[PDB]
Amino acid sequence: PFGKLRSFLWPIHTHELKKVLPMFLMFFCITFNYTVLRDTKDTLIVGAPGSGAEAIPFIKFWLVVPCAIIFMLIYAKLSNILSKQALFYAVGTPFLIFFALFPTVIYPLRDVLHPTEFADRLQAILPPGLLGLVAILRNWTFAAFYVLAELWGSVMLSLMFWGFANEITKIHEAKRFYALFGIGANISLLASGRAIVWASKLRASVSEGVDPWGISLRLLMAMTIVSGLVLMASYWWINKNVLTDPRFYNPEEMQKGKKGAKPKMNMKDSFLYLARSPYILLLALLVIAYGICINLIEVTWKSQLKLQYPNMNDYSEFMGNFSFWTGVVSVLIMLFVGGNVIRKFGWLTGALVTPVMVLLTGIVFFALVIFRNQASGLVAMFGTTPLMLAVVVGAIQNILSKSTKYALFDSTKEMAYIPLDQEQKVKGKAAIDVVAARFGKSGGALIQQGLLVICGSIGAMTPYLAVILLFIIAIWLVSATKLNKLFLAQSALKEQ
Template structure:
C-alpha cells in the first residue's frame, strides 16, 4: 500500500506537470498530444520492452525493479536542475521557425515537439512512469506475492492509500502553483516550481525503493507471508529466452493474453479520444500556465476523492457480482460519460440556456463535464479495471506472467493511446480540426466500447476456467 501511495503520488505530479509543460509551451497546444504519443511515446515503449525482456533474462526480479526505476528518478532530478534552466540554449526556436516558413500550417504540431524537445522527453518519461513503474513493476511484484483469494480481498483496497496520494499530490501541485504567484519579479516561476515538484517526485521514489528493499529483506523471506517452496520453484524454473518478435508471436497465439491486450488497448484509445478534446477546451478556458496547473491540481484531488469511494464500492462489486461484472463497469462508465461529453460539444448551441441558467458559459460547462468524465473514467480504472486486469494474470504460468505482462502493459497501453492519436490525426487532416471531427470521434468511441465488452466477456470465461484448473 505504501509503495503504491509513493508511485501514484509521483505519477500525479508528473502527469499534471507534463501537460502544463507541453500544452502551454511556445507555439504548442493540445493538438501536439496525438503526435507525441504516436511518434515518440510508442517507439520508446517498444524499445523499453525489448530492453526489459533482456533484463528479465539476465537479472533476478529484484534487480530488474531497481534497474528500471532508478534511471527515471535520475532523469527527473536532472530535468529540474540542469535541463530546464538551459532551455533557452537547448530549444532550437529560430531553426524550427526557419523550417516552419517552408511548410504548411498542418505541420505546426510535429514542429512544436522538435521546438520543445526536452519537454517532449519529459512528457514521455512521465507517461512511461505510469506504464513501467505502476503497471509493470509494482503490479508484477504484487502478483508475485499474492494469491487469487488474497487479491480479491486486497487489490481493491491496495489503492485506498494510493488515492489518498492523489488528493495530497493534487493539493501539492496547487500549492506550488499558488506559490509561483508570490515570487519576486525576474525569478522564473516555472524553474522554481519544477524544483519543488521534481524534489517531491525523487523523495517519494526514494521512499518507494526503501519500502521495496525492506519487503525483500523481511516479507519475502518470512514463511508466514510467502510460500517459500513455491517461490523457490519459480526461481529455479528455467526462463525461456525470446526476442521482442518471438515474444509477440508467443503472445498472439494465446487468446487469453490477446483479450487482455484488447482491454488495455481499448481503454487507452477511448480515454485518449475523449481526453485530447477535453484538454483543447481546457487550454481555451485556462491559457495561463499557473491557472492551468492549479485546475489540474484540483482535478487530481477530486479524482483521488471519487476513487476512494469507488474503491469501497469495488470490493463489494467483486464479492457480490464477481470478476465478469466488475470488468464491465469501466467500459460502461467511459461509454456513457464520453458520449455525454461529445453530445455537449456537438449540440453546444442547444446547451447555451442551460449554461446561462447555471451562471457559466458553454465553454466552462464543457470543461467541467469533461473533467467529470475524466474523473469517473479514471476512478473506475483504478478501483475496478486495474484490479481485474491484474487478477487475470495470477492463474498464468511464470513466463506468460512476466513477458505477457511486459507486452500488454508497456506496449498495449501506448498502442491504445497511439491508436487513438492516429485516428485523431487522420480526422484532423481529413476534416480540418478536432472540433469538426467530434461526431466521428463519438461514433468511433461507440465501436471501441463494443469490442471492449466483447473481449471482457471472452476473458471472463477463460479466467473462470483457469481458476477451476488451479
C-alpha cells in the same frame, strides 16, 4: 471464518497488513511522482526562452510511441538477464538519476547542450516534412523530459508496480486487495495538490532571481527523488521481510521463488509467442478499448460541458466538484463496491460493470445529443434541458468510469495476469501496459482529429463517435467476455 459484516466491509485480516500497507505506500509514491511529473512537464513546456513549446506534438508522435517501443524492447531484454528485484531497481534508478541530473546538470545547461545552433541549416537539408526532428533536436532536453514524464506512469505504475503485485498476490487475495490500491492514488493526489501549488507559489522571483524554473524545478524534482527512494525502500522492505514471512507464502513455496521462474526466451521469439496468444491480444484489446472509450466519452462529454458552461469560472467549479466527488465515489467503490462485486458475482461481472454502464448511460447521453431537438418537448416538461441532462448523464459515465478504473477495471485486468506464465506476466505486460496503452490515449486523439477533418465541426461527428463507441464497446465487451473464459480456465490450471 472471517465474519458477517467484515467479510463485506473490510476483507483484510489484521496480519495481512504488512503486505498491503507497503503496497499502498508504493502506489502512493508512484502516483505522486506521476502527477507531479505530468503537472511539471505541462507547466515547464510553456516558458522556454523563445518558442520552445511549439515542438510538443512532434515529440508526441515521433518520440512518445517510438520510445515506448524502445523501452519495451529493452525491458524484454533485461528481463532475461536480471532478477525481479534487479530489474525493478534497474528500471527505477535511471528515472531518479535523470530527475537528479535534470535540475543540476541538464536544465540549467540549456543553451550549452541544446543544438549549437549549427543544427539550423540542417533544417533545410532534410525534406520539408521533418521540420519537427530539427525542433525536437532543438528542444533536446525538454524532449527527454516529456518522454520520461509520460513513460513514468506507463512504466512504474502499470508495468512495475502491478507486475510486482501480480507476482506476489494470489487471485483470492487479489479480489480483496487490488480494488483498494487507488486510495493511495487519491491520497497522493492530495499530496500532489499541495506540492504543485507550493512550487507554483515559490515561482515568484522575477528580479533578483531571474530564473523562474530553477528553484521550483529543483525542489519538485528532489521531491520526486525522495518519493522514488521511499518507493525503492518500500520495495526492499516488502522483499526482505514480506516475501520472507512464513505466515504467507507457506514455507517450502518461498524458495520456489527466490529459486523461481523467469522470462527465458529471445526478443523475436518472445514477441512472436505474445503476438500469437489469444490471451494477450484480448488484454491489449481491453486496454486499447478502454483507452479510446474513456477518452471518447470524455471529449464528447467535455463538449456539452462547454456548451452548458461557456465561462471557465463555473466550468472550474463543476470540474472542481466533479474532481472532488470522483474521489469520494472512488473511495467507497474501492473499499466497498469493487472488492464485493468481484467476490460475490465473479471476474466477468467486475470487467463488465464499467463497459455496460458506459454503454447504457452512453446510449442515454448520445440519445440526448443526437436527438437534442426532438427531446426538448419531453425533457423540457421535466424542468431541464437535454444539454443539462446529457451533462449529468455524461457525468455519471465519467464518475462511474473514473471511479471504476482502479476499483473494477484495473483490479480485474491486473488480476488477469496472475494465472499466467512469466513470459506474459512480465514481458507481455510490457506490451499491453506501455505500448498497447499508448494507442489508447493517442488513438482517441487520432479518431477525434481524423473525424474533425471528415466532418469539419465537432458537433457533426457526434453521430460518428456513437457508431465508433458502439463498436469499441462492442469489441470491449466481447474481449472482456472472451477473456473470462480464458481467465477462469487458466486459473483452473494453477490448482495442479
